[PDB]
Design a protein around this ligand. Structure first.
Ligand SMILES: [Zn+2]
Ligand SMILES: [Zn+2]
Ligand SMILES: [Zn+2]
Length: 81
């Protein structure tokens, strides 16, 4: 694959139509906190309750990876691998 790293800052990627928005019940500050497919690292959430949503004209947002205020635990952005 190919994915731009966002080292030293937040991701902030705006989801595109069709793309998944990952939430983790355990890691997320709250239910608005999401991760894009570039960033979500399955290894961070092996023992966690995760769910995906699908971006539509009406379900939108930006990825919170590397926004320290949005997560209860250190994430290891997938792009860094
Ligand atoms: Zn992201
Ligand atoms: Zn990331
Ligand atoms: Zn998690």
């Amino acid at each position: 694959g190919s994915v731009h790293k966002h080292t030293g800052r937040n991701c902030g990627r705006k989801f595109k139509i069709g793309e998944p928005l990952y939430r983790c019940h355990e890691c997320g500050c709250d239910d608005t906190c999401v991760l894009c497919i570039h960033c979500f690292n399955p290894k961070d959430h092996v023992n966690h309750h995760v769910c995906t949503d699908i971006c539509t004209e009406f379900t939108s947002g930006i990825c919170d990876c590397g926004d320290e205020e949005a997560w209860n635990s250190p994430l290891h952005c997938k792009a860094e691998e």
